[PDB]
C-alpha cells in the first residue's frame, strides 16, 4: 500500500529487469509477490500503485517504458 | 541438449507459469536459465530445443499455445 | 497433508540441496514453504510429514542423512 | 572482489535472512552465488570478502552475529 514497501523491492524490480529484460506491469507484479519477502509485505500492494511506482522510476530515468506496455531498466 | 535435462527442469516451468501466468518463449528461457540449478544444466539448452519440448506438452494437455506466442499453464 | 504434495515438491527439495548443499530440517520446510508454488500447496504439510518424506528419501538412496541432523542430496 | 558488488547484494542478504531466519556464512555465500543478477556479479566475491562484510554489518547494528557461526538479522 505505500512507498516504503515499494522502495524496499525497488532491488528486486531491478534484479527481474536486468535478469529477464523489458516486462509487463503484470508480470513484475505477479513476480514481486513471491520474490519480496512476505515481512516486508507487498502482499498488499495493488497494481495500480506499483503502476504508479514504475512510471515515477520511468520518469526519473532509472526505467524505460518502451511502446505496447513493457519496463525496461537502463 | 537432451530431453533428461528438459524433463528435469519440467517443474521450474510449471512454476513458473503457475506463478506468473502465461509467458513467451524467450522468457521462460532466459528464466530457466537461472531458476534451473546449473548442476542439472540447461545452460546447454538451446531455444529450439525448449521450443520442440514445450510444443510436445501442448500437444499433450499440459500446456496451452496461445495465439501470438505465449504459453500457459492447463 | 499428502505424499502427492510431498511427491510434486521432490525437485524443489532437490535443488535446494543441490543449491546450497546440505540443510536442517526446518531450513528445508521454510524454504520450501517459499519456493513450491501455492497452487500445489504445500502450505498444508506439517514438519513431521516433511521429516517423514525426507527419512524415505535417505532410506532409499536419494539422499544423505549425516549426523547432527542435516540432509545432503545424493 | 569488491565493496560495490557487496553493496547491491545487500538487500538480498537481508530477504534471505528475513525469509529464513539466521544462516551461516557458507550458505549466505551459496544463497548469494543464485539470487544476486549475474549482471552484478558477485560471482567474483571470495568467502573472506563476504565474512568481512558481514562482520561490518554486525558491528554496526545491522546484523547480530550469534555464537556457534551464523547471521541474523536486526
Known amino acids: 500500500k505505500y512507498e516504503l514497501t515499494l522502495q524496499r523491492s525497488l532491488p528486486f524490480i531491478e534484479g527481474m ?3 529477464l529484460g ?15 519477502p512476505k515481512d516486508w509485505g507487498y ?5 495500480q500503485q506499483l503502476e504508479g511506482y514504475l512510471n515515477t522510476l520511468a520518469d526519473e530515468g532509472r526505467l524505460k517504458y518502451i511502446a505496447n506496455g513493457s519496463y525496461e531498466i537502463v
Do not use: E, P, Q
Open 22 to 36: 523489458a516486462m509487463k506491469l503484470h508480470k513484475i507484479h505477479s513476480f514481486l509477490k513471491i520474490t519480496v
Open 43 to 47: 502482499n498488499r500492494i495493488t497494481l
Open 17 to 19: 529487469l536486468t535478469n
